[PDB]
Design a protein around this nucleic acid. Structure first.
Lengths: 122, 163, 175
RNA sequence: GUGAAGAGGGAAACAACCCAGACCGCCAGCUAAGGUCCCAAAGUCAUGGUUAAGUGGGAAACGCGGAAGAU
RNA sequence: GCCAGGCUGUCUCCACCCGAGACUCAGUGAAAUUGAACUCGCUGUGAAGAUGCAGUGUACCCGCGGCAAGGUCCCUAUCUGCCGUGGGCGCUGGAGAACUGAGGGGGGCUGCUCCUAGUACGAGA
RNA sequence: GCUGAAAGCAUCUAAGCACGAAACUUGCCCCGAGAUGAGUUCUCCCUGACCCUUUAAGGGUCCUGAAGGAACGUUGAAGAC
C-alpha cells in the first residue's frame, strides 16, 4: 500500500527508476492509497532521456503492493515491493508498453481494459 | 356588491335546502352540502336565490356575492354537471386512465399517478386528450391543477398539460 | 417476521462456491416459549414476553416458578420483550421456531458488546468512563444461512457480544 | 440636599433618584413617595378618548416609517 | 565549515508485551490554606464577569476513579462544575422478574459509472 | 394553483379553496419512572398469642423467621475498588 512520502518502484519502460509519492487523491483528506487507486508521485532518478524529469507531477497507479491486497476468496496476493506505473490526466494510455512482473485480476475496470492485454505473465 | 344583486335561476330537478347557514343542493349528479358564512342571509326565493348582506358586517356585500357565485356554480353542476378538457402537447406524453387513478408520463423516469376524488369521472376520447366530468367545479379544478402541476406548460414549445 | 432471542456461539467465514466467503456470526436460537402476552386491555400495548433455555431448580425463585407455571413454559435463563407487528397476538405457552427468519433476508442484531476495562479520561472524553457491555443494535444485517432442524442462524458481518452472550434478532425495519 | 456621621419605605437589586430624621415597648388606626391581576397588601372600580402593532415592555436626526443591541 | 548517501514509530496511527507506581487488603502517617459554610446554572445591578443582591430554571443524601473550565513557567487539583459506577432511602405489607415511557444523546456527509439519453429543449452549437 | 370579484378588466385569499426546499420535527438506533408527576404488567410469601398506656398512622413482651438478598467458596470473555 501507500502512505505519506512512500517509495514506489517502476514497472514500465518510461525510464523511471525511483518514484516518490507526494499527494494522495481519490478522496478528500485521504490517508493512504490502494492498488486500484490513483496516486500522486514524482520522479527522483531518470535515464538520459527519461520521460519523467525531476520534480514532475503526474498521476500513477500501483500494480503491486508490498503490504498486499485481498481477494473475495481470501487470497492476499503480495509482492516483494511497491510497483507503480505513471499515468497522465490526459491521454491516460501510458507510454510504457511493457510491464515487469505479474498483475492481479482486479484491473478489469473501465479504464484498465487496455492494460490487461500487456503483462503476459498473468 | 354588484354581483350579489343578481338572484340565480335554479332550473327544474334541483332541490335547495337552507338549514340555518348550511345550504344543501341535490340534483341528478348527487348530493352536495356547503356551510355558508353567517354574514349573509339566504332565503328560498322559489325559482331563485336572493342574497342579503347582514347588518353589522362591513364585508357583507362581497361575502354575499361570493356565496351567490358558489351557489350558482353548484346549481349549474348538479343540474347538468361540469366538464373540463385537457390536452397533452408533446411527443410521448401518454394519458392512460384506469379506475380512479390517472397515470401520466411527461418525461419523468417514473409514472405520475393522481387519485380521483369520489364523484369525478375521467374519459379518454383520444389517448392525448383527457376529459373530466364532475358535479363540483372545485373538485374538477383541483384534479386538473394537480395534473397540470406535474408538467408545467413549457415556455419554449408550449408542451405539457394545457386546458 | 418477529424478533427472536438467541445466544452467540461463534463467527466464521462461510466459503461460497464462487470464492466469495462471507463473514458469518453464528447464533443458536432455541425454540423461545411465549411466557406472556401484553395486550392493550391489560398491559396497554401489543407485545409478547418470551423466555428460552433452562433454569436450575435452585436458580428458579418461587415467584419465578409461579410465573412460569402460569405461563406454562419451562423456566428459561432470561426473559425479554418483543413488540408485535400489529398483526396478531400469540398464545401463552407457544414455542416460536426460527422459520420466521427463513424468508426475511434482512435483520437487525441487538446485543451487548464485549466488556472493556477502565476507560480513562483520554479514552472516554479525549472524567473516566467505560466501554462495552452496552445494548446496541446493529442494523441492516442479512441472514446468510438458516437451519431450523439445528436452530442455527448465520448473519453477515459481526455482532456485539462474545461466545455464549445472549442477543436478539429482529426484522430489519430500518433500510 | 444626601452620604461622610440617619435608620426605614419605594424605584425588581442599588451609596449620591422620590418620600421620610429611628428614646424603648404594645398583634390599633391615619398618611408621604410608590402600588391597588398575581407573585406581594390593596378597585380584575365608574366615565370621555388613542392603541391591532405586545409600540406599552429602549432608542435620535430625517421623508406611521426611520428600528439594528447584549450567551 | 559544507554536501551526497544508508541509517529508527520524531510522524501518517500508533497496536501489543515486559518490570515500579497509579486501585484494594493489614500498620505508620504531614503538609501549604482555613471567619464560619445547608459552597448550582442563566439574565440584570454592584469598587464594574456575584456560590451569598432582584427575576427565572434545574437538582434525592454521601462515597471511589481525573481530563483541568475554575529563563524553577511557581502556588495538594484542598474546594465549585464536570461523566461512569457504588452505599442509604421512597414509590405505602414485603419480594423476584418484564416493560410502556416525560425527557435526554448520537450522528443525517459525499465522488464516479450505467439505463433514461446523446433524450426533452435547442435554428445550429 | 381550480371558480373568483370588491373596483363589468386584473389579482396568492376577500367566500369556496390545493401542492410544495435537503430549511424544522417525527421516522434511524442508545440511555431513561430519583419522571418525588416516584409509572404499567406477571408471579410468590406472611392467615400466632399476650400485656400496658398519655386509647391511637399507640407502645411493650414470648413464639415464629415465609419468598428474597446479602454473608463465604469456585470463579468469568465483569470489574481500579
Amino acid at each position: 500500500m501507500i502512505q505519506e512520502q512512500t517509495m514506489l518502484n517502476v514497472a514500465d519502460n518510461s525510464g523511471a527508476r525511483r518514484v516518490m509519492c507526494i499527494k494522495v487523491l481519490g478522496g478528500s483528506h485521504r490517508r493512504y492509497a490502494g492498488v486500484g487507486d490513483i496516486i500522486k508521485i514524482t520522479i527522483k532518478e531518470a535515464i538520459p532521456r527519461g520521460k519523467v524529469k525531476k520534480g514532475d507531477v503526474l498521476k500513477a497507479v500501483v500494480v503491486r503492493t508490498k503490504k498486499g491486497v485481498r481477494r473475495p476468496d481470501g487470497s492476499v496476493i503480495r509482492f516483494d515491493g511497491n510497483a507503480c506505473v505513471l499515468l497522465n490526466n490526459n491521454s491516460e494510455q501510458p507510454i510504457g508498453t511493457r510491464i515487469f512482473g505479474p498483475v492481479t485480476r482486479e484491473l478489469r475496470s473501465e479504464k484498465f481494459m487496455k492494460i490487461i492485454s500487456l503483462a503476459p505473465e498473468v | 356588491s354588484r354581483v350579489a344583486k343578481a338572484p340565480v335561476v335554479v332550473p327544474a330537478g334541483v332541490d335547495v335546502k337552507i338549514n340555518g347557514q348550511v345550504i344543501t343542493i341535490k340534483g341528478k349528479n348527487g348530493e352536495l352540502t356547503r356551510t355558508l358564512n353567517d354574514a349573509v342571509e339566504v332565503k328560498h326565493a322559489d325559482n331563485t336565490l336572493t342574497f342579503g348582506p347582514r347588518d353589522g358586517y362591513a364585508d357583507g356585500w362581497a361575502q354575499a356575492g361570493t356565496a351567490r357565485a358558489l351557489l350558482n356554480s353548484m346549481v349549474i353542476g348538479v343540474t347538468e354537471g361540469f366538464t373540463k378538457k385537457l390536452q397533452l402537447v408533446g411527443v410521448g406524453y401518454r394519458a392512460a386512465v384506469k379506475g380512479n387513478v390517472i397515470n401520466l408520463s411527461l418525461g419523468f423516469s417514473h409514472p405520475v399517478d393522481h387519485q380521483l376524488p369520489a364523484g369525478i369521472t375521467a374519459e379518454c376520447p383520444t389517448q392525448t386528450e383527457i376529459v373530466l366530468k364532475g358535479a363540483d367545479k372545485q373538485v374538477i379544478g383541483q384534479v386538473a391543477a394537480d395534473l397540470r402541476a406535474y408538467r408545467r406548460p413549457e415556455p419554449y414549445k408550449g408542451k405539457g398539460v394545457r386546458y | 417476521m418477529i424478533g427472536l432471542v438467541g445466544k452467540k456461539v461463534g463467527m466464521t467465514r462461510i466459503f461460497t462456491e464462487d470464492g466469495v466467503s462471507i463473514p458469518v456470526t453464528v447464533i443458536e436460537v432455541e425454540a423461545n416459549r411465549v411466557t406472556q402476552v401484553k395486550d392493550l386491555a391489560n398491559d396497554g400495548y401489543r407485545a409478547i414476553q418470551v423466555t428460552t433455555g433452562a433454569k436450575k431448580a435452585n436458580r428458579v425463585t418461587k415467584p419465578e416458578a409461579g410465573h412460569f407455571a402460569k405461563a406454562g413454559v419451562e423456566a428459561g435463563r432470561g426473559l425479554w420483550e418483543f413488540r408485535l407487528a400489529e398483526g396478531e397476538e400469540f398464545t401463552v405457552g407457544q414455542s416460536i421456531s426460527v422459520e420466521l427468519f427463513a424468508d426475511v433476508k434482512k435483520v437487525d442484531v441487538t446485543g451487548t458488546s464485549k466488556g472493556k476495562g477502565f476507560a480513562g479520561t483520554v479514552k472516554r472524553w479525549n472524567m473516566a468512563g467505560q466501554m462495552g457491555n452496552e445494548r446496541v443494535t446493529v442494523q441492516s444485517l442479512d441472514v446468510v444461512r438458516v437451519d431450523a432442524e439445528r436452530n442455527l442462524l448465520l448473519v453477515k458481518g459481526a455482532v456485539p457480544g462474545a461466545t455464549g452472550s445472549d442477543l436478539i434478532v429482529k426484522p430489519a425495519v430500518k433500510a
